[model samples]
Target: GSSGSSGELHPRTGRLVSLSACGRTARRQQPGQEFNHGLVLSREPLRDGRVFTVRIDRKVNSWSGSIEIGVTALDPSVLDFPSSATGLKGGSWVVSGCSVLRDGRSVLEEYGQDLDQLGEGDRVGVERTVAGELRLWVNGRDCGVAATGLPPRVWAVVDLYGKCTQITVL
Candidate 1:
């Protein structure tokens, strides 16, 4: 809290950002839904041709739940549910474990990196290029181009699940 560009710091993480809206989403909750009344960092509508990035500051509780980061066209108020591991309902893309799922398909796998293995202070990110290709990064290491062909506009989404899982956006 100063006279600079600093906004409010997350109570637990010390990272500075705008007001955060954290809670449950969707019209119905389903098993393996992977997302609960969690938190997400966002952008209203995607740029025409630039990559968007989000990082989870690691403070997580993967022991019983999981964290997923991706892009979604579905608003939090909508009831789009996941049918499988894709984490896609309506239209979204997420990275889990070592795979990148799009519309419920494994577009990228065996990356030697697992989101579950990410620990305190670790990071996971999603970026969309001008060509609509999706990429992921963990702890600043590139996960390579995970997928191609994405909608021009989407929201930068972060999902935190479980009882103690939480994070700071960086």
Candidate 2:
């Protein structure tokens, strides 16, 4: 019902605290760019070998939209995802249509888990080891190693569409 942007991270949760405005984009808080949705990223970058999980907390508008999640270079500007509808963008690793994508190609189709079929409480995340290998997890199921040789600093990115659909970094 309202419009703006979130400029801070949650203190206790250390995640995107709130976002209601539109910029070219925003880092913390639930930031909205082009159209009836918001895309949010973790304010804190993940450490090597740590399991960074983002739970699909809620879905709005009767699944009219979805939360496409993945990890990208810590610098959000490296990827131009806002203008993309599907597949990988700007070298970011993503999972869609039940397959893992890198550079718009299905590099990992070992799993048949479709993100469009997921809803609130279901989870999808990317994990990175200290050595920089990335993997995908759907509802806690591992989809195997996705890519090797990634940048050391990466942030969890979530693409939330529709009016009220929201995703969270836990």
Candidate 3:
């Protein structure tokens, strides 16, 4: 079953964040509706103009009950603070990026070379985007890169260690 509810409040304009579980949000409610009850990662901006929203699936052993991460862009006027994230401090994450659309579809672009070659215990980071078609490192590298995977619109979940976090979109 899906793990969330759909509703709206006539907001003069507001942001509501929940710290306790309720309705479809109880600790044991569903696989994707619960937070692992661990430390929440603060939104360290991936970029200034862009905001991030996310959901956690489960922890550490991500293959079966895995952990996933995704991004979404939102209209700030009706937006709220994202639910803090909880993740495993051990074992590295194979991070990727995508863009999701309102038309119910996504387009993927991959950045950073040599993924799939990454192995156990190795930490990796996908630059998400290669700034300008002119991105260059001091050592000289190409920058304009299109990332892979359409950012998820809903159910963008990941499995961390021992827990699942509810979905969040930015």
Candidate 4:
């Protein structure tokens, strides 16, 4: 299996990308307050067995939650960004704080590293195997397959929510 190249987040090309009802929270570019509205998607879809990794670039302790990483079959162009990845319903699989969520419900109570334990400089990743299983990685350590029966095509979704303020695709 081959890992894919790093891609930009939505609205990167300067085109009109619609966001959730909380408009300002979904946009990446902001003045002096880039930490809010951290929901973002890969600029492109991932190929089978391709791994997408991101580094935690910043952290803000003021918020109560942590980061969320996963894959979503929904097209980024049409996605109505949610404040939290777990808030997404259907065609979305996200992992947060050792739990795996599918369609906004917890399918696995404990999975990979507890995202709350991660802070600035830690790296986290998600990949869909050729067999359609989702796997997670924390700080270069493979945490094994976290979920199965994923869609054939999907895009990486990262929520730099709460304590996690920013992330850089790797």
User: In order, what is each prediction's RMSD in angstroms?
Assistant: 7.5, 8.1, 13.4, 5.8
Q: List ranges where model 1 is wrong by over 4 Å.
A: 1-41, 48-52, 55-64, 75-86
Could you tell me the TM-score of candidate 3?
0.28
lDDT of 1 by residue, 53-169 (tens): 434533434346555666666554443434322456556777766777776666778655577666565666667777787777676667777767877766566555542144444
The TM-score obtained by model 2 is: 0.63
Model 3 agreement with the true structure over 1-170: per-residue lDDT tens digits: 85332211111211222223322221122334443332222222234222223323212333233222322233223333233221222111222222211222333335343222222322212122323111111112332333333222211122222323232222
Query: Residue-wise lDDT of candidate 2 within 50-95, one digit each (tens)?
Result: 5556555455544354445566663544334353323445556666
Cand. 4 Cα-lDDT: 0.71
Stretches of candidate 3 off by over 4 Å are: 1-42, 48-63, 74-104, 109-120, 126-170
Q: Write the per-residue lDDT of candidate 4 for residues 1-170, one digit (tens) a residue.
A: 65444544565222222233322122334424444353688877877766778787667666576778898888878887776677776679998779988888888876757777887768888888988888887767788877888888888888765677566777
**Candidate 4 RMSD to the correct structure:** 5.8
Off by over 4 Å in 2: 1-38, 61-65, 77-81, 84-88, 110-113, 138-141, 162-164
Q: Give the TM-score of candidate 1.
A: 0.63
Least well predicted 10-residue stretch by lDDT in candidate 4:
15-24
What is the lDDT, from 0 to 100, of the residue 61 in candidate 4? 67
